[PDB]
Ligand binder design. Structure first.
Ligand SMILES: Cc1c(COc2cc(F)c(CNCC(=O)CC(=O)O)cc2F)cccc1-c1ccc2c(c1)OCCO2
Lengths: 124, 126
């Protein structure tokens, strides 16, 4: 039974830091990239994807442009980690790691962002 | 490119009625049942999980037990139709239809429930 697992379902990160949220899927024999789909979203915003071939930036939500990447060569180890650079207050929320590979599953991850007064005030 | 489509992304239904909400996906003449996964959820509650040509409980959420079914006769037309019988106020919200069939895609559908005072009052107090 194909299952996606997340080692942590809660991250608490500092405004302005970099964040890597881990997401794991089973890979027994050699990874068959042509059969794999990885999709990340947060509250219906397309963050990143890898669809058999590769990544399609055309559908990426503007709030994640040039800040989000998938570590591509960790996919052969069953690792679908999302890296977000320069965390913003709008990055707080519930993320979903959706994977298709000889089955389909997803997991949720909650992200909390701590931020100083100056940053919070501008977002106010 | 594999695409799921919703003819309607908004349903307005009466409390106590039956509702069928639909996602369409492309089927080229013949459905390969072994390849298809259909998953319906509302607010992280599992409603339907169709895998290997059969519906799969007991991952189904208790709120939807015996009230939710996938109309399997529609699948060969590429229609993933969720029927919910005896609609309740707690059925209002955002539904998602997640489909793997070669490719994978998902769509959202918003459901609003109208209800008379007596039904809302019970929902209000519990
Ligand atoms: C729904 C799903 C995805 C969705 O992947 C994507 C979702 C997107 F919106 C997009 C972006 N829009 C699609 C696109 O670029 C062109 C187009 O319009 O077709 C890309 C995805 F890969 C990727 C991987 C697995 C599953 C999935 C499918 C069925 C499931 C399930 C997960 O888990 C629970 C069981 O059922």
């Amino acid at each position: 039974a194909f299952t996606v697992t997340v080692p942590k379902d809660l991250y608490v990160v500092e405004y302005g830091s970099n964040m890597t949220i881990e997401c794991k899927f089973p890979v027994e024999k050699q990874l068959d990239l042509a059969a794999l789909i990885v999709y990340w979203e947060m509250e219906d915003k397309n963050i990143i994807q890898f669809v058999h071939g590769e990544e399609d930036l055309k559908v990426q939500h503007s709030s994640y442009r040039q800040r989000a990447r998938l570590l591509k060569d960790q996919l052969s180890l069953g690792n679908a980690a999302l890296q977000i650079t320069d965390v913003k207050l709008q990055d707080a929320g519930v993320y979903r790691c959706m994977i298709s590979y000889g089955g389909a599953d997803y997991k949720r991850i909650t992200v909390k962002v701590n931020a100083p007064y100056a940053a919070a005030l501008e977002h106010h």
